[PDB]
PDB file of C-alpha atoms and ligand atoms in Angstrom:
ATOM      1  CA  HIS A   9     141.508 113.098-130.640  1.00  0.00           C
ATOM      2  CA  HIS A  10     140.042 112.355-133.435  1.00  0.00           C
ATOM      3  CA  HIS A  11     139.606 109.164-134.280  1.00  0.00           C
ATOM      4  CA  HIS A  12     137.735 106.446-136.479  1.00  0.00           C
ATOM      5  CA  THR A  13     136.295 103.028-135.906  1.00  0.00           C
ATOM      6  CA  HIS A  14     136.175  99.690-137.221  1.00  0.00           C
ATOM      7  CA  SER A  15     135.153  96.021-137.198  1.00  0.00           C
ATOM      8  CA  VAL A  16     135.796  92.638-139.034  1.00  0.00           C
ATOM      9  CA  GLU A  17     134.037  90.362-139.336  1.00  0.00           C
ATOM     10  CA  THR A  18     136.137  86.706-138.553  1.00  0.00           C
ATOM     11  CA  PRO A  19     135.088  82.818-138.972  1.00  0.00           C
ATOM     12  CA  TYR A  20     135.439  83.571-134.527  1.00  0.00           C
ATOM     13  CA  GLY A  21     133.184  86.819-134.661  1.00  0.00           C
ATOM     14  CA  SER A  22     133.322  90.780-135.003  1.00  0.00           C
ATOM     15  CA  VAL A  23     135.985  92.292-133.250  1.00  0.00           C
ATOM     16  CA  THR A  24     136.184  96.306-133.212  1.00  0.00           C
ATOM     17  CA  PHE A  25     139.308  98.568-133.892  1.00  0.00           C
ATOM     18  CA  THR A  26     139.907 102.844-133.011  1.00  0.00           C
ATOM     19  CA  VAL A  27     142.506 104.567-135.468  1.00  0.00           C
ATOM     20  CA  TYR A  28     144.149 107.494-134.003  1.00  0.00           C
ATOM     21  CA  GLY A  29     146.867 109.521-135.910  1.00  0.00           C
ATOM     22  CA  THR A  30     147.947 108.752-140.123  1.00  0.00           C
ATOM     23  CA  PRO A  31     150.230 105.801-141.128  1.00  0.00           C
ATOM     24  CA  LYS A  32     153.593 106.849-142.394  1.00  0.00           C
ATOM     25  CA  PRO A  33     155.460 105.178-144.745  1.00  0.00           C
ATOM     26  CA  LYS A  34     158.174 104.036-142.759  1.00  0.00           C
ATOM     27  CA  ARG A  35     156.497 103.101-139.107  1.00  0.00           C
ATOM     28  CA  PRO A  36     155.374 100.571-137.846  1.00  0.00           C
ATOM     29  CA  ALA A  37     151.375 100.837-136.104  1.00  0.00           C
ATOM     30  CA  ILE A  38     150.817 100.902-132.366  1.00  0.00           C
ATOM     31  CA  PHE A  39     148.469  98.167-132.030  1.00  0.00           C
ATOM     32  CA  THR A  40     146.885  97.492-128.688  1.00  0.00           C
ATOM     33  CA  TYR A  41     144.889  94.912-126.822  1.00  0.00           C
ATOM     34  CA  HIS A  42     143.227  95.226-124.040  1.00  0.00           C
ATOM     35  CA  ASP A  43     143.498  93.047-120.479  1.00  0.00           C
ATOM     36  CA  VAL A  44     139.873  91.424-118.954  1.00  0.00           C
ATOM     37  CA  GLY A  45     137.301  93.634-117.676  1.00  0.00           C
ATOM     38  CA  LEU A  46     138.418  96.597-119.521  1.00  0.00           C
ATOM     39  CA  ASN A  47     138.579  97.908-123.313  1.00  0.00           C
ATOM     40  CA  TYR A  48     141.215 100.400-125.137  1.00  0.00           C
ATOM     41  CA  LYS A  49     139.684 103.177-123.102  1.00  0.00           C
ATOM     42  CA  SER A  50     139.758 101.860-119.565  1.00  0.00           C
ATOM     43  CA  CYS A  51     142.881 100.562-120.490  1.00  0.00           C
ATOM     44  CA  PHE A  52     145.166 102.660-122.048  1.00  0.00           C
ATOM     45  CA  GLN A  53     143.640 106.097-122.157  1.00  0.00           C
ATOM     46  CA  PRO A  54     145.438 107.266-119.120  1.00  0.00           C
ATOM     47  CA  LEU A  55     148.881 106.193-120.769  1.00  0.00           C
ATOM     48  CA  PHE A  56     148.019 107.244-124.045  1.00  0.00           C
ATOM     49  CA  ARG A  57     146.950 111.024-123.296  1.00  0.00           C
ATOM     50  CA  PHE A  58     149.529 111.669-120.888  1.00  0.00           C
ATOM     51  CA  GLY A  59     151.309 114.703-122.124  1.00  0.00           C
ATOM     52  CA  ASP A  60     154.222 113.407-122.351  1.00  0.00           C
ATOM     53  CA  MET A  61     152.978 110.606-124.300  1.00  0.00           C
ATOM     54  CA  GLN A  62     151.137 112.423-126.499  1.00  0.00           C
ATOM     55  CA  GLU A  63     154.438 113.696-127.230  1.00  0.00           C
ATOM     56  CA  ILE A  64     156.310 110.447-127.779  1.00  0.00           C
ATOM     57  CA  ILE A  65     153.605 109.173-130.208  1.00  0.00           C
ATOM     58  CA  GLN A  66     151.766 111.828-131.557  1.00  0.00           C
ATOM     59  CA  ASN A  67     153.618 110.938-134.851  1.00  0.00           C
ATOM     60  CA  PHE A  68     152.457 106.724-135.002  1.00  0.00           C
ATOM     61  CA  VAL A  69     149.140 105.301-136.216  1.00  0.00           C
ATOM     62  CA  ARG A  70     147.408 104.049-133.667  1.00  0.00           C
ATOM     63  CA  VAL A  71     145.234 100.691-133.856  1.00  0.00           C
ATOM     64  CA  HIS A  72     143.003  99.677-130.280  1.00  0.00           C
ATOM     65  CA  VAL A  73     141.360  96.599-130.728  1.00  0.00           C
ATOM     66  CA  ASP A  74     138.480  96.206-128.505  1.00  0.00           C
ATOM     67  CA  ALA A  75     137.920  92.183-127.535  1.00  0.00           C
ATOM     68  CA  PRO A  76     134.543  90.619-129.403  1.00  0.00           C
ATOM     69  CA  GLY A  77     132.027  91.780-126.979  1.00  0.00           C
ATOM     70  CA  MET A  78     133.945  94.780-124.554  1.00  0.00           C
ATOM     71  CA  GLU A  79     133.345  97.746-126.825  1.00  0.00           C
ATOM     72  CA  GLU A  80     131.788 101.108-126.265  1.00  0.00           C
ATOM     73  CA  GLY A  81     127.741 100.087-126.427  1.00  0.00           C
ATOM     74  CA  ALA A  82     128.351  96.348-127.182  1.00  0.00           C
ATOM     75  CA  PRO A  83     125.121  94.148-127.058  1.00  0.00           C
ATOM     76  CA  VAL A  84     125.421  90.853-124.340  1.00  0.00           C
ATOM     77  CA  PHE A  85     126.057  88.064-126.366  1.00  0.00           C
ATOM     78  CA  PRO A  86     122.833  85.478-124.807  1.00  0.00           C
ATOM     79  CA  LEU A  87     124.356  82.843-122.610  1.00  0.00           C
ATOM     80  CA  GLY A  88     125.348  79.664-124.165  1.00  0.00           C
ATOM     81  CA  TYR A  89     127.775  81.507-126.721  1.00  0.00           C
ATOM     82  CA  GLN A  90     130.648  79.921-127.238  1.00  0.00           C
ATOM     83  CA  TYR A  91     132.993  83.014-126.744  1.00  0.00           C
ATOM     84  CA  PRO A  92     136.486  82.605-128.766  1.00  0.00           C
ATOM     85  CA  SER A  93     139.687  81.232-127.238  1.00  0.00           C
ATOM     86  CA  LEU A  94     143.266  83.326-126.658  1.00  0.00           C
ATOM     87  CA  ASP A  95     144.249  81.707-129.155  1.00  0.00           C
ATOM     88  CA  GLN A  96     141.158  82.902-131.418  1.00  0.00           C
ATOM     89  CA  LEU A  97     141.199  85.828-130.613  1.00  0.00           C
ATOM     90  CA  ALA A  98     144.981  86.212-132.122  1.00  0.00           C
ATOM     91  CA  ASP A  99     143.641  84.372-135.138  1.00  0.00           C
ATOM     92  CA  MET A 100     141.692  87.355-136.220  1.00  0.00           C
ATOM     93  CA  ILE A 101     144.454  90.192-136.114  1.00  0.00           C
ATOM     94  CA  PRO A 102     145.843  89.016-138.907  1.00  0.00           C
ATOM     95  CA  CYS A 103     142.052  90.394-140.451  1.00  0.00           C
ATOM     96  CA  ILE A 104     142.210  93.524-138.924  1.00  0.00           C
ATOM     97  CA  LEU A 105     146.040  94.262-140.390  1.00  0.00           C
ATOM     98  CA  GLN A 106     144.630  93.018-143.909  1.00  0.00           C
ATOM     99  CA  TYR A 107     141.260  95.364-143.485  1.00  0.00           C
ATOM    100  CA  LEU A 108     144.191  97.970-142.328  1.00  0.00           C
ATOM    101  CA  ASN A 109     146.752  96.731-145.013  1.00  0.00           C
ATOM    102  CA  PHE A 110     149.130  97.661-142.332  1.00  0.00           C
ATOM    103  CA  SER A 111     152.211  95.430-142.543  1.00  0.00           C
ATOM    104  CA  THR A 112     154.130  95.852-139.725  1.00  0.00           C
ATOM    105  CA  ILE A 113     153.307  96.649-135.732  1.00  0.00           C
ATOM    106  CA  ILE A 114     154.615  97.615-131.996  1.00  0.00           C
ATOM    107  CA  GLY A 115     152.553  95.075-130.316  1.00  0.00           C
ATOM    108  CA  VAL A 116     151.250  96.787-126.106  1.00  0.00           C
ATOM    109  CA  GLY A 117     149.117  94.592-124.491  1.00  0.00           C
ATOM    110  CA  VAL A 118     147.525  93.877-120.353  1.00  0.00           C
ATOM    111  CA  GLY A 119     147.137  90.436-118.844  1.00  0.00           C
ATOM    112  CA  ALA A 120     145.216  88.145-121.687  1.00  0.00           C
ATOM    113  CA  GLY A 121     145.406  91.252-124.385  1.00  0.00           C
ATOM    114  CA  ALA A 122     149.571  90.381-123.634  1.00  0.00           C
ATOM    115  CA  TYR A 123     149.240  86.883-124.397  1.00  0.00           C
ATOM    116  CA  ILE A 124     147.046  87.316-127.043  1.00  0.00           C
ATOM    117  CA  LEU A 125     149.461  89.455-128.991  1.00  0.00           C
ATOM    118  CA  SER A 126     152.579  87.727-128.404  1.00  0.00           C
ATOM    119  CA  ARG A 127     150.891  84.196-129.794  1.00  0.00           C
ATOM    120  CA  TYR A 128     150.457  86.918-132.835  1.00  0.00           C
ATOM    121  CA  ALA A 129     153.940  87.040-132.867  1.00  0.00           C
ATOM    122  CA  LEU A 130     154.593  83.626-132.799  1.00  0.00           C
ATOM    123  CA  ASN A 131     152.236  83.309-136.059  1.00  0.00           C
ATOM    124  CA  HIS A 132     153.640  85.843-137.812  1.00  0.00           C
ATOM    125  CA  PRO A 133     157.003  86.881-136.614  1.00  0.00           C
ATOM    126  CA  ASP A 134     157.424  88.868-139.599  1.00  0.00           C
ATOM    127  CA  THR A 135     155.196  91.521-138.856  1.00  0.00           C
ATOM    128  CA  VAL A 136     156.017  92.627-135.634  1.00  0.00           C
ATOM    129  CA  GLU A 137     158.712  95.186-134.821  1.00  0.00           C
ATOM    130  CA  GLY A 138     158.166  94.421-130.976  1.00  0.00           C
ATOM    131  CA  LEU A 139     155.911  94.179-127.992  1.00  0.00           C
ATOM    132  CA  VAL A 140     155.471  95.597-125.181  1.00  0.00           C
ATOM    133  CA  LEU A 141     153.693  93.110-122.435  1.00  0.00           C
ATOM    134  CA  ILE A 142     152.591  94.500-119.464  1.00  0.00           C
ATOM    135  CA  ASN A 143     151.561  91.387-116.820  1.00  0.00           C
ATOM    136  CA  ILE A 144     151.979  88.726-119.045  1.00  0.00           C
ATOM    137  CA  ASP A 145     151.760  84.816-117.956  1.00  0.00           C
ATOM    138  CA  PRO A 146     151.924  82.646-120.690  1.00  0.00           C
ATOM    139  CA  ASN A 147     151.782  79.457-118.941  1.00  0.00           C
ATOM    140  CA  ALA A 148     148.438  77.100-118.602  1.00  0.00           C
ATOM    141  CA  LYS A 149     146.999  76.972-115.621  1.00  0.00           C
ATOM    142  CA  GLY A 150     147.962  73.532-113.454  1.00  0.00           C
ATOM    143  CA  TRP A 151     145.689  71.293-111.451  1.00  0.00           C
ATOM    144  CA  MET A 152     147.209  73.427-108.765  1.00  0.00           C
ATOM    145  CA  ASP A 153     145.870  76.435-110.118  1.00  0.00           C
ATOM    146  CA  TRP A 154     142.719  75.829-110.719  1.00  0.00           C
ATOM    147  CA  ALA A 155     142.706  74.639-107.201  1.00  0.00           C
ATOM    148  CA  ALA A 156     143.386  77.770-106.379  1.00  0.00           C
ATOM    149  CA  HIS A 157     141.579  79.505-108.455  1.00  0.00           C
ATOM    150  CA  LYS A 158     138.165  77.272-107.358  1.00  0.00           C
ATOM    151  CA  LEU A 159     138.972  77.839-103.460  1.00  0.00           C
ATOM    152  CA  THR A 160     138.952  81.418-103.851  1.00  0.00           C
ATOM    153  CA  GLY A 161     135.479  80.849-105.768  1.00  0.00           C
ATOM    154  CA  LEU A 162     134.348  79.832-102.990  1.00  0.00           C
ATOM    155  CA  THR A 163     134.215  83.303-101.361  1.00  0.00           C
ATOM    156  CA  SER A 164     134.929  85.793-104.368  1.00  0.00           C
ATOM    157  CA  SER A 165     132.499  86.800-106.701  1.00  0.00           C
ATOM    158  CA  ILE A 166     132.990  86.922-110.193  1.00  0.00           C
ATOM    159  CA  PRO A 167     133.984  90.718-110.465  1.00  0.00           C
ATOM    160  CA  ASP A 168     135.757  90.433-107.495  1.00  0.00           C
ATOM    161  CA  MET A 169     138.522  87.617-109.374  1.00  0.00           C
ATOM    162  CA  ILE A 170     138.620  89.641-112.327  1.00  0.00           C
ATOM    163  CA  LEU A 171     139.615  93.132-110.287  1.00  0.00           C
ATOM    164  CA  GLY A 172     142.231  90.489-108.397  1.00  0.00           C
ATOM    165  CA  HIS A 173     143.578  89.387-111.574  1.00  0.00           C
ATOM    166  CA  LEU A 174     143.915  93.481-112.181  1.00  0.00           C
ATOM    167  CA  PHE A 175     144.842  94.796-108.919  1.00  0.00           C
ATOM    168  CA  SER A 176     146.970  93.537-105.765  1.00  0.00           C
ATOM    169  CA  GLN A 177     144.579  92.775-102.510  1.00  0.00           C
ATOM    170  CA  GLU A 178     146.829  94.812-100.739  1.00  0.00           C
ATOM    171  CA  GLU A 179     145.634  98.114-103.428  1.00  0.00           C
ATOM    172  CA  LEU A 180     141.846  96.709-103.423  1.00  0.00           C
ATOM    173  CA  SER A 181     141.917  96.710-100.274  1.00  0.00           C
ATOM    174  CA  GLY A 182     142.929 100.733-100.062  1.00  0.00           C
ATOM    175  CA  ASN A 183     140.112 102.524-101.706  1.00  0.00           C
ATOM    176  CA  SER A 184     142.369 104.847-102.964  1.00  0.00           C
ATOM    177  CA  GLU A 185     140.124 106.888-105.844  1.00  0.00           C
ATOM    178  CA  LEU A 186     141.426 105.225-109.248  1.00  0.00           C
ATOM    179  CA  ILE A 187     140.941 101.600-107.364  1.00  0.00           C
ATOM    180  CA  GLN A 188     137.210 103.435-106.122  1.00  0.00           C
ATOM    181  CA  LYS A 189     136.752 103.743-110.193  1.00  0.00           C
ATOM    182  CA  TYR A 190     137.862 100.659-111.357  1.00  0.00           C
ATOM    183  CA  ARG A 191     135.977  98.622-108.748  1.00  0.00           C
ATOM    184  CA  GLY A 192     132.560 100.649-110.238  1.00  0.00           C
ATOM    185  CA  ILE A 193     133.663 100.293-113.728  1.00  0.00           C
ATOM    186  CA  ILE A 194     133.797  96.369-113.444  1.00  0.00           C
ATOM    187  CA  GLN A 195     131.091  95.828-110.435  1.00  0.00           C
ATOM    188  CA  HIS A 196     128.801  97.397-112.799  1.00  0.00           C
ATOM    189  CA  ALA A 197     129.728  96.808-115.983  1.00  0.00           C
ATOM    190  CA  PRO A 198     126.854  96.938-118.241  1.00  0.00           C
ATOM    191  CA  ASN A 199     128.270  93.661-120.374  1.00  0.00           C
ATOM    192  CA  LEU A 200     130.404  92.420-117.344  1.00  0.00           C
ATOM    193  CA  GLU A 201     128.469  88.759-118.666  1.00  0.00           C
ATOM    194  CA  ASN A 202     130.582  89.600-121.819  1.00  0.00           C
ATOM    195  CA  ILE A 203     133.860  90.188-119.398  1.00  0.00           C
ATOM    196  CA  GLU A 204     132.780  86.962-117.507  1.00  0.00           C
ATOM    197  CA  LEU A 205     133.720  84.979-121.123  1.00  0.00           C
ATOM    198  CA  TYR A 206     136.848  86.597-121.893  1.00  0.00           C
ATOM    199  CA  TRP A 207     138.075  85.753-118.194  1.00  0.00           C
ATOM    200  CA  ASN A 208     137.082  82.168-118.858  1.00  0.00           C
ATOM    201  CA  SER A 209     138.703  81.835-122.461  1.00  0.00           C
ATOM    202  CA  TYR A 210     142.018  83.466-120.506  1.00  0.00           C
ATOM    203  CA  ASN A 211     142.091  80.724-117.893  1.00  0.00           C
ATOM    204  CA  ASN A 212     141.972  77.942-119.787  1.00  0.00           C
ATOM    205  CA  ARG A 213     144.471  79.432-122.163  1.00  0.00           C
ATOM    206  CA  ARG A 214     147.008  76.776-123.486  1.00  0.00           C
ATOM    207  CA  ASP A 215     150.773  77.014-122.518  1.00  0.00           C
ATOM    208  CA  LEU A 216     152.627  79.863-125.012  1.00  0.00           C
ATOM    209  CA  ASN A 217     156.168  78.642-125.803  1.00  0.00           C
ATOM    210  CA  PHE A 218     159.115  81.118-125.409  1.00  0.00           C
ATOM    211  CA  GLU A 219     161.272  78.960-125.007  1.00  0.00           C
ATOM    212  CA  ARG A 220     161.372  75.207-126.897  1.00  0.00           C
ATOM    213  CA  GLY A 221     164.157  73.224-126.252  1.00  0.00           C
ATOM    214  CA  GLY A 222     166.097  76.560-124.006  1.00  0.00           C
ATOM    215  CA  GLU A 223     165.957  78.073-127.367  1.00  0.00           C
ATOM    216  CA  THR A 224     163.733  81.283-127.171  1.00  0.00           C
ATOM    217  CA  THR A 225     161.093  81.310-129.255  1.00  0.00           C
ATOM    218  CA  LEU A 226     160.338  85.478-130.014  1.00  0.00           C
ATOM    219  CA  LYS A 227     162.683  87.546-132.070  1.00  0.00           C
ATOM    220  CA  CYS A 228     161.510  90.953-132.170  1.00  0.00           C
ATOM    221  CA  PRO A 229     162.607  93.172-129.365  1.00  0.00           C
ATOM    222  CA  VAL A 230     160.162  93.373-126.095  1.00  0.00           C
ATOM    223  CA  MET A 231     159.700  95.280-122.729  1.00  0.00           C
ATOM    224  CA  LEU A 232     158.375  93.764-119.950  1.00  0.00           C
ATOM    225  CA  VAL A 233     156.101  95.413-117.519  1.00  0.00           C
ATOM    226  CA  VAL A 234     155.137  94.203-114.689  1.00  0.00           C
ATOM    227  CA  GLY A 235     154.259  95.568-110.771  1.00  0.00           C
ATOM    228  CA  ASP A 236     156.348  94.772-107.490  1.00  0.00           C
ATOM    229  CA  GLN A 237     154.324  92.620-105.340  1.00  0.00           C
ATOM    230  CA  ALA A 238     151.382  92.590-107.910  1.00  0.00           C
ATOM    231  CA  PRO A 239     149.724  89.677-109.035  1.00  0.00           C
ATOM    232  CA  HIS A 240     151.661  88.429-112.268  1.00  0.00           C
ATOM    233  CA  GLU A 241     155.298  89.501-110.911  1.00  0.00           C
ATOM    234  CA  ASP A 242     156.622  86.464-110.358  1.00  0.00           C
ATOM    235  CA  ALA A 243     154.795  85.374-114.383  1.00  0.00           C
ATOM    236  CA  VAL A 244     157.377  88.266-115.888  1.00  0.00           C
ATOM    237  CA  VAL A 245     160.099  87.065-114.171  1.00  0.00           C
ATOM    238  CA  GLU A 246     160.111  84.000-115.302  1.00  0.00           C
ATOM    239  CA  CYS A 247     159.812  85.135-118.446  1.00  0.00           C
ATOM    240  CA  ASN A 248     162.132  87.816-118.478  1.00  0.00           C
ATOM    241  CA  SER A 249     164.616  84.473-117.761  1.00  0.00           C
ATOM    242  CA  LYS A 250     163.149  82.680-121.377  1.00  0.00           C
ATOM    243  CA  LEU A 251     163.741  85.888-123.829  1.00  0.00           C
ATOM    244  CA  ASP A 252     166.687  86.712-125.169  1.00  0.00           C
ATOM    245  CA  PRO A 253     168.270  88.803-122.708  1.00  0.00           C
ATOM    246  CA  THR A 254     170.450  91.148-125.897  1.00  0.00           C
ATOM    247  CA  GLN A 255     166.950  91.394-127.390  1.00  0.00           C
ATOM    248  CA  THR A 256     164.589  92.265-123.644  1.00  0.00           C
ATOM    249  CA  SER A 257     164.142  95.078-121.262  1.00  0.00           C
ATOM    250  CA  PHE A 258     162.283  94.272-118.251  1.00  0.00           C
ATOM    251  CA  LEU A 259     160.544  97.310-115.704  1.00  0.00           C
ATOM    252  CA  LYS A 260     160.001  95.748-112.306  1.00  0.00           C
ATOM    253  CA  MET A 261     158.234  98.859-110.715  1.00  0.00           C
ATOM    254  CA  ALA A 262     158.359  99.448-107.598  1.00  0.00           C
ATOM    255  CA  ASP A 263     155.150 101.363-106.343  1.00  0.00           C
ATOM    256  CA  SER A 264     153.043 100.740-109.665  1.00  0.00           C
ATOM    257  CA  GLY A 265     150.502  97.976-107.933  1.00  0.00           C
ATOM    258  CA  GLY A 266     148.931  95.556-110.630  1.00  0.00           C
ATOM    259  CA  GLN A 267     147.885  98.313-114.020  1.00  0.00           C
ATOM    260  CA  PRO A 268     151.620 100.161-114.052  1.00  0.00           C
ATOM    261  CA  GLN A 269     150.082 101.542-117.357  1.00  0.00           C
ATOM    262  CA  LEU A 270     146.857 103.856-115.667  1.00  0.00           C
ATOM    263  CA  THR A 271     149.744 104.802-112.187  1.00  0.00           C
ATOM    264  CA  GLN A 272     153.415 105.344-113.520  1.00  0.00           C
ATOM    265  CA  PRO A 273     152.888 106.202-116.878  1.00  0.00           C
ATOM    266  CA  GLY A 274     155.794 108.872-116.222  1.00  0.00           C
ATOM    267  CA  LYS A 275     157.785 106.042-116.643  1.00  0.00           C
ATOM    268  CA  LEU A 276     156.102 104.184-118.639  1.00  0.00           C
ATOM    269  CA  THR A 277     156.054 107.147-121.311  1.00  0.00           C
ATOM    270  CA  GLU A 278     160.103 107.331-120.575  1.00  0.00           C
ATOM    271  CA  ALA A 279     160.393 103.416-121.180  1.00  0.00           C
ATOM    272  CA  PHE A 280     158.527 103.621-124.763  1.00  0.00           C
ATOM    273  CA  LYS A 281     160.424 106.505-125.304  1.00  0.00           C
ATOM    274  CA  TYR A 282     163.898 104.201-125.498  1.00  0.00           C
ATOM    275  CA  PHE A 283     161.986 101.060-126.981  1.00  0.00           C
ATOM    276  CA  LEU A 284     160.957 103.240-129.957  1.00  0.00           C
ATOM    277  CA  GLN A 285     163.794 105.334-131.174  1.00  0.00           C
ATOM    278  CA  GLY A 286     165.661 105.545-133.923  1.00  0.00           C
TER     279      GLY A 286
HETATM  280 MG1   MG B   1     154.443  84.318-141.802  1.00  0.00          MG
HETATM  281 MG1   MG B   2     157.477  75.363-122.072  1.00  0.00          MG
END
């Protein structure tokens, strides 16, 4: 698993990205963006290093983004630091791609990462050959979503609420080895204060429109993924109703829970194969 790690300076701060494999003339880069509370390794290593996935992605160059302050070893931003909005995080992507001189990507995002890459694709559609969107929720919180959030926050800590964004309450109750591991990752994150600022940016996101005036806005192939009964199911189901069905696939996974790329890498690998196959 040899790689090389870079960053770029942008008007909204520095962002880190890690490159595996080598670029090739025909082919897009697989470009990933992780969810709140994770980084590229805790979000994507279990999938990307799954043996059957290694086979599928070996000949692609992979560019794995760590959002600002989420990279391994990140300093904790001083309290008061104004963290980029999700839109601003999407606006850093052209800098990364310009630095690498990679003109085309297949974006793979989870949660907030899926929003960010969707925003990027709307901004620069001629650079995106497809998107894999896990747990995408493109809607801003309304008054009532804020009400629910704030009420929950009376009895839940920030880390509790981030774990509830990532996993179903049923999973969190069941103390599987995975959940125990990820509880520790989030609760005890040395950069938890940074993670919280990314959480806030996610919660404050504006509407991202996959349709306008009843017409779909995204023009690339999209593979939607969510767990059945998982926190973001209704949002992903709604996205599926707004995208062009001739260019869209939707895996609602029966037994995946909130982070399907962590629990069902075998099933997701076969999905990835058919998404990338020529
Ligand atoms: Mg353009
Ligand atoms: Mg709308």
